[PDB]
């Protein structure tokens, strides 16, 4: 499949932030 996964309940997990500063600003360690 090619569609994105969508998540509206969980916070951004820091494990996916790579080197994106937007991600790191809002993530949580889960």
């Amino acid at each position, epitope marked *: 499949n090619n*569609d*994105f*996964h*969508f*998540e*509206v*309940f*969980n*916070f*951004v997990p820091c494990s*996916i932030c*790579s080197n*994106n500063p*937007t*991600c790191w*600003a*809002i993530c949580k360690r889960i």
Partner: antibody
Amino acid sequence: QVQLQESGPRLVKPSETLSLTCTVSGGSTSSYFWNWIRQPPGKGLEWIGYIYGSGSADYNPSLKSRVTISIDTSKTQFSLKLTSVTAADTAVYYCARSGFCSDDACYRRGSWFDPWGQGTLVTVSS
Amino acid sequence: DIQMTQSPSSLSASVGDRVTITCRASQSIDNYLNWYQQKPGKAPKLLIYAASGLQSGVPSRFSGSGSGTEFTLTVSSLHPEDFATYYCQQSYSTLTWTFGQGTKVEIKR
């Protein structure tokens, strides 16, 4: 630059349906979350609802019974439909994007509204 | 439901004054508080994201502080072009994001 633009009728009779479309350029509706927000003249801002993906949507409870948001098959447009309007629905209506997207996942919680459309005034009167 | 209480409603200040606006959330929202600036007849423009991130393109005289329930937007030195209405906005709720009532900043001269 992802840019947003609202369009639709500027005058709606009471009890009829208010409809607007937001056109997205430089981007696609197949990622991120697409929002509608309104502001009555001289008042504050009220979030209306959002849509994403294949067409999953959810709504402000103060309006849920009267509001539907839909996503178009070109994947460059989304639309607001608001029924049973009264003069209380007179307002400037904005569309806006929200959410953070990585390569394969888009998260809404803790994000913000950016970019915004220009906003269009809609007047409910007979 | 999460309500934001923004104070004050209105303020007048001189060029070069330090201005502070406060926003209180009805429950804890961690750092997920955003600030916008709206000039008359225009869409709100994002100034601060996630409580203290300074949005690209915004001058550093704007800054945000706080976490939990008490947040502050500060203009270190007011400029004439800072005349606007400022709004906080919480993105912690899973459903309804909400704004404060706004703070109209007028320039005294």
